[PDB]
Amino acid sequence: ISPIFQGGSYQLNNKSIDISSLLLDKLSGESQTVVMKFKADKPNSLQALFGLSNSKAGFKNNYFSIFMRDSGEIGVEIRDAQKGINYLFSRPASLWGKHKGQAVENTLVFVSDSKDKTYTMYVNGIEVFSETVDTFLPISNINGIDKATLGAVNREGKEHYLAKGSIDEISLFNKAISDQEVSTIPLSNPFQLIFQSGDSTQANYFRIPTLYTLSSGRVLSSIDARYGGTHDSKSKINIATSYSDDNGKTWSEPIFAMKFNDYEEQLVYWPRDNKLKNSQISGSASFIDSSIVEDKKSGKTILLADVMPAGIGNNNANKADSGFKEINGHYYLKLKKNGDNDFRYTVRENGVVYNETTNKPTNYTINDKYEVLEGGKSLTVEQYSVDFDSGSLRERHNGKQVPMNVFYKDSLFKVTPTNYIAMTTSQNRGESWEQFKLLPPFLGEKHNGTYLCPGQGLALKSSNRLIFATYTSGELTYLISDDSGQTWKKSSASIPFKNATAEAQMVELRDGVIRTFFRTTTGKIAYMTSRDSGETWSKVSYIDGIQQTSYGTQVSAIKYSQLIDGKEAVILSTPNSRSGRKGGQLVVGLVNKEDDSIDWKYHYGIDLPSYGYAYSAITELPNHHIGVLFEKYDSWSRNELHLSNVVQYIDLEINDLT
């Protein structure tokens, strides 16, 4: 259909523009649709983009507005005093501010639909809220409406919520357009999506991105596919991966690298209200935090992740048990049988379930996939689904059968309730992935498995050595394999923090010289150096000129292949802020060949300082551009839980950074 209004290039400099003569009479019916292309790269703290109101005295609570905050949040208000209606829908982290030194054209689409009694907002091709009321309030049915306003709301004659920015195009429709039509409205997005709600993973939520450029030029990406909101385990999470063969222009329909089936892969809309937002999927097994590297010698691609048995995450993780019993050089996975109160079984060679108390094998066995066999026949369990139908999270059986897995709740033999690490491998550069295998323990029986640092492993340019940074309390623990990931040894490096979350990423400054940048609890990003290919590690230092928060945030880094100002260069991706996870930056450091020290010359703000920015992934593309797959929200704030499509991808050229 056609618009009943269409104006444009409205500049908003803390002064409201009246357009009521150009709209109010054309308002008709109980269903409207607003489409607005706008820019705000310097917004006020809270500001109205568009507004209908009742400006007459005694009716300051009678208005529709479309507002944004400088945290990037967007929302509508719908208020009518005489009806006793005060609606307030919004979603944080819904906007872009700047990109490549320029204002982003945001494309806002708000549909008000009285047939379905639903309010729905889109920004930049993404749906950020869709709410249904029992008592619908048409935005043109607000009693006594007399003003249509751009960049403020006119209440009792005054401008409230004055906006700074601009509205290049705005148009209204006397209909509720279908979801189908919304997708037809062209976008001017500065970003694109790899993983998204509705894709093959069926996860409404995504966290913990990774980027890697293969020898072929293929770019690989792995992700936490999180089903029960954006929570860390305990939850249900799978590891999903997807690649790109055109420098990051197009991406493949994601497959799973790691997956459990104890729970149904459901696209749920996790609740965002204060009472229910702490709901966790508590009975499921999961994976958190993946990391990728490529082995030059074999050709294999190698993915590691943390593994959680049913119920378990970091909070209740059996700190001080590895899950394995050591019997002369060997590490056998411990198991508990239903009814027992201690772990009286182990898994020996060929998956045979061996009894300890008797030293006799049993009629039970474990296959490739950590499933359970009895006499060679496959035991099963019944899958769980989740729903909120009774106004409270319920986790019940759904009638479907899956193979019994030792990481599952209902399983006959359960593994130790602690955290492990698994590796999987791809012989075809990420088109499929082998069944995962558990990595051994490295710090003794009576110590829990360490925590894989998410992002990139390191493949040393002038050898076959592969390294994956992991962390535990008190140290960084590098895992090192010189045989294509078949065997591993550890290399500890003491860090001056008890119980830190020391997420580490490495760079190779020149042959055998690895610098690791890691997250601390001091507000400052730390680092250490190796000069024997990771064998031994230096003492800790700290980057000045980048600020983090007291808890801090994952940092990702690459060595750039090219020279910048004649010196060898290194790029950091991190939030740059000491309040929260916002103010994303790519920071360029030039290496000094005298002491291998780094001069942090260049700061590039990915978006506005006040706009959200969390865990990130960088990679040097085949054509020397930079890919950045990142969480565009405050992944720490309890106000920005459960947000769809905030993990986003962008393409930059060096010149943008310098």
Judged by DSSP in three states, 302 sits in: strand
Find out whether 244 and 219 touch, Cβ atoms under 8 Å: yes
Report residue 657: phi and psi, to 5°.
-80, -30
Contacts of 329 (CB under 8 A, 6+ apart): none
Judged by DSSP in three states, 349 sits in: helix
Per-residue DSSP letters for 560-615? EEEEETTEEEEEEEEE--SSSSBSEEEEEEEEETTTTEEEEEEEEESS-TTSB--S
Both tokens of residue 518? Answer: 């890691």
What is the distance between the alpha carbons of residues 308 and 286, in angstroms, rounded to a whole number?
A: 5
Q: Is the peptide bond before 234 cis (omega within 30 degrees of 0)?
A: yes
167 class by beta-carbon count within 10 Å (0-12 exposed, 13-18 middle, 19+ buried)? buried
Q: What does this entry list as its resolution, in Å?
A: 2.7
- Residue of 212, 364, 384, 615 marked catalytic: 615
Cα distance from N-terminal residue to C-terminal residue, the chain = 46
Count of C-beta atoms within a 10 Å radius of residue 327: 11
What amino acid occupies position 245?
A: D
What is the distance between the alpha carbons of residues 595 and 309, in angstroms, rounded to a whole number?
A: 46
- Residue ranges of alpha helices (H) inside 479-572 are none
Both tokens of residue 348? Answer: 């020996």
Q: Is 344 annotated as a binding residue?
A: no
What is the distance between the alpha carbons of residues 499 and 160, in angstroms, rounded to a whole number?
A: 47
| Tokens 């020290």 belong to residue | 597
| Tokens 């055998």 belong to residue | 512
What is the distance between the alpha carbons of residues 86 and 63, in angstroms, rounded to a whole number?
A: 10
Decide if 382 is catalytic: no
What is the distance between the alpha carbons of residues 198 and 179, in angstroms, rounded to a whole number?
A: 14
For 405, how many CA atoms within 13 A lie in the half-sphere containing its CB?
A: 22
Q: Is 531 annotated as a binding residue?
A: no
Find out whether 290 and 208 touch, Cβ atoms under 8 Å: yes
What amino acid occupies position 505?
A: Q
Contacts of 650 (CB under 8 A, 6+ apart): 99, 190, 191, 192, 606, 627, 628
Of residues 531, 159, 175, 237, the one with CA closest to residue 407: 237
Contacts of 358 (CB under 8 A, 6+ apart): none
Judged by DSSP in three states, 180 sits in: helix
Count of C-beta atoms within a 10 Å radius of residue 198: 11
What is the dihedral sign for C-alpha 432, 434, 435, 440?
negative
Find out whether 473 and 424 touch, Cβ atoms under 8 Å: no
Question: Angle CA(524)–CA(527)–CA(529) in degrees, nearest 5?
Answer: 165
287 class by beta-carbon count within 10 Å (0-12 exposed, 13-18 middle, 19+ buried)? buried
Residues β-bridged to residue 493: 476
Question: Angle CA(312)–CA(314)–CA(316) in degrees, nearest 5?
Answer: 55
What is the distance between the alpha carbons of residues 431 and 258, in angstroms, rounded to a whole number?
A: 13
Find out whether 57 and 49 touch, Cβ atoms under 8 Å: no
- Residue of 265, 503, 607, 640 marked catalytic: 503
Reported in sequence order, the residue ranges of 102-177 that DSSP labels E, i.e. its strands, are 102-103, 106-113, 118-123, 126-132, 147-150, 153-155, 158-160, 164-173
At the topology level, CATH places domain 191-319+418-658 in Neuraminidase (2.120.10)
Query: Among the CATH numbers 3.50.30.10, 2.120.10.30, 2.60.120.200, 3.30.565.10, which is that of 1-190?
Result: 2.60.120.200
Decide if 227 is catalytic: no
Of residues 26, 7, 45, the one with CA closest to residue 161: 45
What is the distance between the alpha carbons of residues 120 and 33, in angstroms, rounded to a whole number?
A: 10
Using alpha carbons, list the distances in angstroms from residue 274 to 73, 216, 235, 278, 279: 17, 48, 19, 8, 10
What is the distance between the alpha carbons of residues 364 and 366, in angstroms, rounded to a whole number?
A: 7
Of residues 373, 368, 380, 483, the one with CA closest to residue 433: 368
Both tokens of residue 419? Answer: 């955290």
250 class by beta-carbon count within 10 Å (0-12 exposed, 13-18 middle, 19+ buried)? exposed
What is the distance between the alpha carbons of residues 534 and 511, in angstroms, rounded to a whole number?
A: 11
What is the distance between the alpha carbons of residues 271 and 388, in angstroms, rounded to a whole number?
A: 9
Of residues 63, 76, 67, 33, the one with CA closest to residue 49: 67
Give domain 320-417's CATH architecture: Beta Barrel (2.40)
Both tokens of residue 57? Answer: 């005295």
SS3 breakdown of the chain: % helix, strand, coil, rounded to 5?
5, 45, 50
Per-residue DSSP letters for 436-479? PEEPPPSS-TTS---EEPSEE-EE-TTSS-EEEEEE-SSEEEEE
What is the distance between the alpha carbons of residues 437 and 368, in angstroms, rounded to a whole number?
A: 8
What is the distance between the alpha carbons of residues 632 and 611, in angstroms, rounded to a whole number?
A: 8
Q: Is 226 annotated as a binding residue?
A: no
Strands 584-592 and 567-575, bridge-based pairing:
antiparallel
- Residue of 232, 294, 321, 651 marked catalytic: 232
Using left for φ > 0, alpha for ψ between -120 and 50, and beta otherwise, residue 639 falls in: alpha
Question: Angle CA(511)–CA(512)–CA(513) in degrees, nearest 5?
Answer: 90
Of residues 314, 292, 290, the one with CA closest to residue 223: 290
Residue ranges covered by each domain of the chain: 1-190, 191-319+418-658, 320-417
Decide if 503 is catalytic: yes
441 class by beta-carbon count within 10 Å (0-12 exposed, 13-18 middle, 19+ buried)? buried
What is the distance between the alpha carbons of residues 392 and 569, in angstroms, rounded to a whole number?
A: 52
